[PDB]
């Protein structure tokens, strides 16, 4: 009966942005004040709804999307953005009604050699639809020779790792993101 936000905000591991995790929140009491009365979040932006009025509203569905990206990509998690994350990994719709929450996770998600656990899609022929997920790992044929499932020249694997390292600059450091969607009335 107490809605499971601690499971979402404090999972030991977060998903890769290309394989972003969706957790449905339904049929329980949620105290959203624990989020908005925290000062440990580096981004807290709500579109079409104010976070202070959330405890007072009734929603049919609530979804909590969660993933890791890097610092200078956090601006792509918003309606009407373009870029690698917005176009190929996680696309928010223009009419998004919800909250985007992010914080620096450099202590958790960096390793000294480089964390190769967290991945992103590098390229896609066409842009993702809003809230679409593409987890395919098809070799991309950039030339006229068929790739035949193997990486080669003009034959490219569509993902790469962030390689997070503690000594990276804040732009390249890992940031954990939670996107709360609200389906109204």
């Amino acid at each position, epitope marked *: 009966n107490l809605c499971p936000f601690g499971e979402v905000f404090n999972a030991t591991r977060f998903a890769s942005v290309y394989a972003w995790n969706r957790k449905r929140i339904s049929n329980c009491v949620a105290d959203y004040s624990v989020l908005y009365n925290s000062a440990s979040f580096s981004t807290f932006k709500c579109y079409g709804v104010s976070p202070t009025k959330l405890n007072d509203l009734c929603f049919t569905n609530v979804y909590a999307d969660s993933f890791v990206i890097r610092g200078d990509e956090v601006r792509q998690i918003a309606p009407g953005q373009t870029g690698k994350i917005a176009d190929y990994n996680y696309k928010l719709p223009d009419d998004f009604t919800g909250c985007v929450i992010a914080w620096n996770s450099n202590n958790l998600d960096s390793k000294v050699g*480089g964390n190769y656990n967290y991945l992103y899609r590098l390229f896609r022929k066409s842009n993702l639809k809003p809230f679409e997920r593409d987890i395919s790992t098809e070799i991309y044929q950039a030339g*006229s020779t068929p790739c035949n499932g193997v990486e080669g020249f003009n034959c490219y694997f569509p993902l*790469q790792s962030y390689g997070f390292q503690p000594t990276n600059g804040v732009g390249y450091q890992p940031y954990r993101v939670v996107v709360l969607s609200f389906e109204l009335l």
Partner: antibody, heavy 120, light 108 residues
Framework: EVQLVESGGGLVKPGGSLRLSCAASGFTFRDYDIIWIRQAPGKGLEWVSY????????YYSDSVRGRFTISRDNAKNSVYLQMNSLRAEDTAVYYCARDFGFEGPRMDVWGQGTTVTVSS | DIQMTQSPSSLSASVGDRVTITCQASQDIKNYLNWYQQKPGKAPKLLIY???NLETGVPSRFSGSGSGTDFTFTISSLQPEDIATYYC?????????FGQGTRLEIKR
């Protein structure tokens, strides 16, 4: 600024070795394949080697296959080219070039190169 | 190996003249072609990519044409700073191969 900086070129005896480096700043190095191209003094451009983002897919030209070894370290923003059993005709400026692969612009930024002289 | 046949090997022309450089591939390479400009002592610099596309920041006097085997690179109105050697380059297959290519001088 997007920069590729080749280093490690110098004088070397025939049959000797050199390790060339290609160091990247101002872009996400790990999103680009790296390609080497060389220019002999007074001459044109000849492809030498290719290494993928992963550092697992590798090719060499017929001129250098079996003598040169290309490798990658994305944590250091660097690609290396180990040259062994060097010959007189390996004398050249060696260029490093990023290549996105998926679409153009293809091989769009090169560094200013490093000069290798093979002579006794 | 794809052989790229560039022509002419050198060209001299007045400021404001139009100059043309051609490149012919030994097989069909569609638009997998770049034209580079190499000023003396510098790296080759990409001017035209994918055969006809002007690269960001490159002046509009530069342009490219063609697909498959026959390719053309053109400077509308030659300027003093266009002194360089120009090269075509195919990227359809390995080995990556270049024209030989073209030393441009200015007649004054």
């Amino acid at each position: 600024e997007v920069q590729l900086v080749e280093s490690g070129g110098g004088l070397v005896k025939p049959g000797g070795s050199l390790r060339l480096s290609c160091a990247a700043s101002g872009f996400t190095f790990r999103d680009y394949d790296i390609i080497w191209i060389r220019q002999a003094p007074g001459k044109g451009l000849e492809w030498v080697s290719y290494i993928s983002r992963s550092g697992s897919t590798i090719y060499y030209s017929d001129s250098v296959r079996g003598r040169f070894t290309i490798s990658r370290d994305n944590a250091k923003n660097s690609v290396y080219l180990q040259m062994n059993s060097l010959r007189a005709e390996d004398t050249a400026v060696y260029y490093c070039a990023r290549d996105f692969g998926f679409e153009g612009p293809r091989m769009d930024v090169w560094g200013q190169g490093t000069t290798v002289t093979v002579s006794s | 190996d794809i052989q790229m046949t560039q022509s002419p090997s050198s060209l001299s022309a007045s400021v404001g003249d139009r100059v043309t450089i051609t490149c012919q591939a030994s097989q069909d390479i569609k638009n997998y072609l770049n034209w580079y400009q190499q000023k003396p002592g510098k790296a080759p610099k990409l001017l035209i990519y994918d055969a006809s596309n002007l690269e960001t920041g490159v002046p509009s006097r530069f342009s490219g044409s063609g697909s498959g085997t026959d390719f053309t690179f053109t400077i509308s109105s030659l300027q003093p700073e266009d002194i360089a050697t120009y090269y075509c380059q195919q990227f359809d297959n390995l080995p990556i191969t270049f024209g030989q290519g073209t030393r441009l001088e200015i007649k004054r």
